[PDB]
């Protein structure tokens, strides 16, 4: 008799373990749903990351090493550390220097043609 | 710092537990000034924990 | 290690003596250990054990007539091939070699 009662209760417990296996599957699918929503989202925003293939890097290198080309009808932007770098001209000539650095640079390179790099005034 | 014998036992016991429960109180051997940058190829330049040796 | 770290129950105080061993007993047993270490270092104690011996039954190299320090005593009987190995190695430990892992080189080694 105890045989039958334990046989029973354990068939039920096995069934409930299966039922949990199934509710668990369902919960994992819901997971993947809410993970689609979240992840498709961050993957559009990754479509915007303008990647530079090998065919276009030889242009973007010039375009970025040309960020402060000593003359520009705009004001120039900052750095990753955000100073105004000494706005060079071409092939390696520091030809426009801000005022936090002209005093020190000309004192140590007495014979460089230095220039006080005037940012693009807002007035005009 | 020796009424906190049991506060140094704790952070000795932990570093042991990381050292596989063996090198309780063992510390990392003093290497050098230039240890990580002159020693040659094949011998651990940055002093490992104790229980590596 | 084959060495005995404590030559004596240095730690003996009443249980819960919140330390490994009182400085008294530590000094007593460091005197026993200074006697043991000077006995060894001054009779120029040398032991040895080589592979494929029963490594527990040590070799007494300082008890060899080629490295004997005593004169009226007889050190030990050792096979000739093993003797020529050992005592050559004892001579070999008489200097440390530049171009290898160095070693602590003592006078009492020779």
């Amino acid at each position: 008799k105890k045989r039958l009662e334990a046989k029973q209760m354990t068939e039920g417990r096995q069934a409930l373990k299966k039922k949990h296996l199934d509710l668990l599957r369902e919960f994992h699918e819901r997971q993947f749903f809410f993970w689609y929503e979240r992840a498709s989202e961050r993957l559009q925003s990754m479509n915007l990351i303008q990647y530079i293939p090998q065919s276009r890097v030889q242009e973007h290198i010039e375009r970025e090493l040309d960020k402060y080309v000593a003359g520009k009808s705009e004001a120039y932007p900052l750095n990753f550390v955000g100073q105004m770098p000494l706005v060079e001209d071409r092939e390696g000539n520091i030809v426009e220097v801000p005022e936090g650095l002209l005093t020190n640079h000309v004192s140590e390179h007495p014979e460089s043609t230095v220039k006080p790099h005037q940012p693009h005034e807002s007035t005009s | 710092p020796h009424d906190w014998r049991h506060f140094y036992a704790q952070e000795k016991l932990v570093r042991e537990r990381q050292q596989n429960g063996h090198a309780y109180g063992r510390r990392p051997k003093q290497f050098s000034f230039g240890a990580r940058y002159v020693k040659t190829e094949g011998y651990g330049k940055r002093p490992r924990l104790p229980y590596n040796k | 290690r084959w060495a005995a770290k404590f030559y004596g129950r240095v730690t003996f105080g009443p249980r819960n003596y919140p330390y490994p061993s009182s400085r008294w007993l530590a000094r007593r047993f460091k005197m026993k250990k200074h006697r043991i270490i000077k006995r060894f270092r001054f009779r120029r104690y040398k032991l040895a054990a080589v592979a494929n011996l029963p490594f527990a039954k040590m070799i007494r190299v300082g008890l060899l007539p080629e490295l004997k320090s005593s004169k009226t005593k007889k050190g030990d009987d050792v096979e000739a091939d093993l003797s020529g190995r050992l005592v050559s190695a004892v001579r070999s430990s008489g200097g440390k070699k530049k171009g290898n892992r160095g070693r602590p080189k003592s006078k009492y080694q020779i």
Binding site: L21, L24, R25, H28, E29, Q31, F32, F33, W35, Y36, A39, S40, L43, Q44, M46, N47, I49, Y51, P53 | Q18, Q19, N20, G44, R48, L49, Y51, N52, K53 | R1, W2, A3, I37, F40, R41, Y45, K46, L47, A48, A49, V50, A51, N52, L53, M58, V61, D81, R85, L86, A89, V90, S92, S93, R101, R103, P104, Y108, Q109
Partner: protein, 360 residues
């Protein structure tokens, strides 16, 4: 040129190195203590099959088809196009099954996005932890019963088998990381403790495992001291696998048992029903038995054409049955082990035997 000798000086802490100071790199022994200077070719192929990036096999595709044909038909019409509903979720029943790319990014999600994004999240940029875990999930996928069980014997054995391989490849590259020695050692103890239920629940997977992960050294018993009295065997007992057999479906359970009334053995009821329970016998067990099968042909070819030699050895044995030690049968005479039945008489009187005991 001779056993290496260390010159211990007692006044010091511990010896000097040997003068034949043979090794330089400490040699990395197994879980129970045997060398490998590298892993087997199986495992080096399993390193190139881990660092090239495993692709999800097409078995999942085809099971998804012949399993959910409606989600496949939806995909069948939707192939290539930027999808706004996940018609592959039932194909990837869990985060981990999406090991074919990065971040559990299922293949059929990246269509519309940039080819550069598809390159970013492909098998080419998976971290090394990513790639190890990828192989892990793929294998725990094809050895598990249902895709949520990670505690099956086969599941666990394969997972820890890959695990111990990456560990050994770590070590045989970097030697003095001995916390990792005690990583590999305990992990292998558990992989053995799982494979030694696998080869008791279904050995087929067990040998596919054996011959794909080439690890038999972690089952190979170490110390005869144990496996003389059968303790390396007691483990599949202790776990509860003494009866996980199904002889009713491999080895015909009829003759594997004696009787109670008779007392006769397994092979004797197999005699009285005509069945052949016997292992494959090695060539030695074969030749000893063929030789024991021809002794009566030898007797018939001996006594019949050289009954002189038959008679000659008659004389030899007939004198010997009277010479020698004993001639009647007492318990003192035929206690079936004299030397150990009589201990008080072996060093002094009976110098025939040099020891008091030779058997169990």
């Amino acid at each position: 040129e001779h056993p290496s000798i260390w010159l211990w000086y007692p006044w010091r802490m511990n010896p000097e190195p040997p003068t034949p100071g043979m090794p330089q790199r400490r040699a990395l022994k197994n879980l129970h203590g045997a060398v490998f200077t590298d892993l087997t070719p199986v495992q080096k192929k399993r390193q190139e099959q881990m660092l090239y990036g495993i692709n999800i096999p097409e078995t999942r595709q085809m099971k998804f088809e012949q399993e959910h044909p409606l989600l496949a038909s939806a995909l069948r019409q939707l192939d290539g196009q930027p999808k706004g509903f996940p018609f592959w979720y039932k194909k990837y029943p869990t985060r981990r099954h999406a090991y074919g790319n990065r971040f559990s990014i299922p293949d059929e999600m990246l269509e519309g996005y940039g080819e550069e994004m598809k390159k970013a999240l492909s098998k080419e940029m998976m971290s090394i932890q990513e790639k190890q875990f990828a192989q892990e999930a793929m294998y725990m996928e094809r050895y598990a019963e249902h895709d949520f069980d990670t505690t099956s014997p086969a599941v666990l054995a394969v997972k820890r088998a890959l695990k111990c391989r990456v560990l050994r490849n770590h070590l045989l590259t970097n030697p003095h990381n001995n916390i990792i020695k005690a990583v590999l050692a305990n992990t292998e103890k558990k992989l053995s403790h799982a494979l030694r239920k696998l080869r008791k629940v279904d050995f087929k997977k067990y040998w596919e495992i054996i011959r794909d992960h080439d690890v038999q050294d972690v089952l190979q018993p170490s110390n005869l001291v144990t496996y003389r009295q059968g303790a390396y065997w007691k483990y599949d007992w202790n776990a509860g696998l003494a009866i996980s057999t199904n002889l009713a479906d491999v080895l015909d359970p009829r003759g594997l048992n004696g009787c109670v009334e008779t007392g006769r053995s397994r092979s004797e009821v197999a005699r009285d029903l005509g069945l052949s329970y016997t292992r494959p016998l090695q060539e030695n067990e074969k030749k000893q038995l063929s030789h024991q099968a021809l002794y009566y042909e030898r007797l018939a070819k001996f006594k019949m054409e050289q009954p002189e030699a038959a008679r000659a050895l008659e004389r030899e044995r007939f004198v010997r049955k009277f010479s020698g030690m004993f001639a009647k049968m007492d318990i003192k005479s035929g206690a079936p082990d004299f030397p150990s039945t009589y201990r008080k008489l072996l060093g002094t009187k009976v110098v025939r035997w040099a020891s008091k005991r030779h058997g169990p």
